[PDB]
Amino acid sequence: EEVRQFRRLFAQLAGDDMEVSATELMNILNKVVTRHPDLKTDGFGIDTCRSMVAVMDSDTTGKLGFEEFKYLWNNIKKWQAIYKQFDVDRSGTIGSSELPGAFEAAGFHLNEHLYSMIIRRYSDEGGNMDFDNFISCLVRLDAMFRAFKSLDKDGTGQIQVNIQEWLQLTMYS
Amino acid sequence: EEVRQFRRLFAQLAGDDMEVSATELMNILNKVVTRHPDLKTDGFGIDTCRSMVAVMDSDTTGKLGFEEFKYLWNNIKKWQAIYKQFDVDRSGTIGSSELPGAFEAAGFHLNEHLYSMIIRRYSDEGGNMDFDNFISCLVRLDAMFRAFKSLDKDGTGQIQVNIQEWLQLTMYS
Ligand SMILES: O=C(O)[C@@H](S)Cc1ccc(I)cc1
Ligand SMILES: O=C(O)[C@@H](S)Cc1ccc(I)cc1
Ligand SMILES: [Ca+2]
Ligand SMILES: [Ca+2]
Ligand SMILES: [Ca+2]
Ligand SMILES: [Ca+2]
Ligand SMILES: [Ca+2]
Ligand SMILES: [Ca+2]
Ligand SMILES: [Ca+2]
Ligand SMILES: [Ca+2]
Numbered sequence: 001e002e003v004r005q006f007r008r009l010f011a012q013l014a015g016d017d018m019e020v021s022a023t024e025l026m027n028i029l030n031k032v033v034t035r036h037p038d039l040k041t042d043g044f045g046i047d048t049c050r051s052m053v054a055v056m057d058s059d060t061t062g063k064l065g066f067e068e069f070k071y072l073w074n075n076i077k078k079w080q081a082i083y084k085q086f087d088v089d090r091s092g093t094i095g096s097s098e099l100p101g102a103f104e105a106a107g108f109h110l111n112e113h114l115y116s117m118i119i120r121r122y123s124d125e126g127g128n129m130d131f132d133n134f135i136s137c138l139v140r141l142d143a144m145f146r147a148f149k150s151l152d153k154d155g156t157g158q159i160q161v162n163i164q165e166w167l168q169l170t171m172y173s
Numbered sequence: 174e175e176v177r178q179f180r181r182l183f184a185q186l187a188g189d190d191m192e193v194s195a196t197e198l199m200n201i202l203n204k205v206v207t208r209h210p211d212l213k214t215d216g217f218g219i220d221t222c223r224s225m226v227a228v229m230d231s232d233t234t235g236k237l238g239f240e241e242f243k244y245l246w247n248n249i250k251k252w253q254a255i256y257k258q259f260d261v262d263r264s265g266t267i268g269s270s271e272l273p274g275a276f277e278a279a280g281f282h283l284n285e286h287l288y289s290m291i292i293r294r295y296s297d298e299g300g301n302m303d304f305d306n307f308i309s310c311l312v313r314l315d316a317m318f319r320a321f322k323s324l325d326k327d328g329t330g331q332i333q334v335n336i337q338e339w340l341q342l343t344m345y346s
Contacts, residue, residue, distance in 0.1 A: 047309075145336075167314075167318075168286075
């Protein structure tokens with residue numbers, strides 16, 4: 001079945017310690033993104049991969065276990081289609097005007113100010129965002145949203161943290 | 174004088190828009206780190222440089238103005254000496270056991286748990302941290318500390334933020 005062979009794929013990629021490290025993730029991500037040329041990218045760099053891993057490392061093993069990796073993979077599959085769908089000009093990248101729809105389709109409703117911050121940090125001098133940047137951003141964004149909600153189950157619209165929780169959440173990303 | 178020629182150096186590097194972008198920073202950082210072989214590194218990647226810039230972008234111009242760049246440069250100069258000083262085994266990298274002293278000398282007192290998170294995210298499979306990782310971490314750490322203090326001038330040991338401040342602070346880094 002599908003679930004069957006994916007479980008094997010993970011075991012195979014995880015290797016010796018049975019979890020996927022940043023280096024492992026980076027290698028598989030690159031090799032795969034190469035088969036999809038319609039997704040322009042300068043590649044997944046090691047640093048970007050270390051951020052995605054840490055931000056996905058809920059059990060703080062330093063690496064990705066099966067579920068974490070599964071969560072991340074599905075997300076990438078989904079965000080991958082949304083990327084192509086919204087690249088209406090077939091530039092291979094997500095433009096400043098295509099982004100909002102892309103993010104919203106993915107399920108993230110941001111306001112003008114947040115979108116501008118996103119462009120500034122994850123898009124190029126031309127307001128364009130390649131694929132590794134797009135995926136990297138959504139992973140982090142999705143994770144920051146979840147972190148917020150979990151610390152505000154009482155839904156007051158505000159979370160309160162001491163300096164150690166803060167550093168943990170901001171440095172481990 | 175010294176202040177005189179540094180002001181020229183910035184103007185020269187900033188170029189057309191007169192601020193230093195991530196690409197500009199990355200180029201100057203690399204070219205410089207090359208003259209210092211005692212500082213092992215696989216280089217400053219574009220993504221790492223985009224994080225340092227954003228985290229240093231207090232006025233949100235998307236790039237580094239003179240003061241921001243000056244602040245960052247002094248820090249690097251200082252953290253650069255602390256790096257060499259504490260690399261007692263002349264490995265060219267900062268080891269798991271040399272880190273605490275290095276960070277503390279720099280002025281950051283963390284606890285066992287925070288140090289472990291740091292190693293996990295910024296050190297290699299061998300618990301080693303190269304120079305671009307070391308500088309990158311301190312810049313972010315220093316910035317996260319400042320962000321916390323500014324939001325807690327009443328010194329209650331806690332800061333409270335809504336979802337937009339949160340996303341701004343976590344995504345723009
Ligand atoms: O072609 C595939 O295997 C799939 S599931 C879609 C996909 C496209 C790009 C990446 I990177 C990862 C996954
Ligand atoms: O040799 C120099 O110019 C100096 S100030 C120290 C330094 C060393 C490494 C970096 I990257 C930046 C600055
Ligand atoms: Ca592994
Ligand atoms: Ca994990
Ligand atoms: Ca496009
Ligand atoms: Ca990229
Ligand atoms: Ca410039
Ligand atoms: Ca600025
Ligand atoms: Ca050392
Ligand atoms: Ca490095």
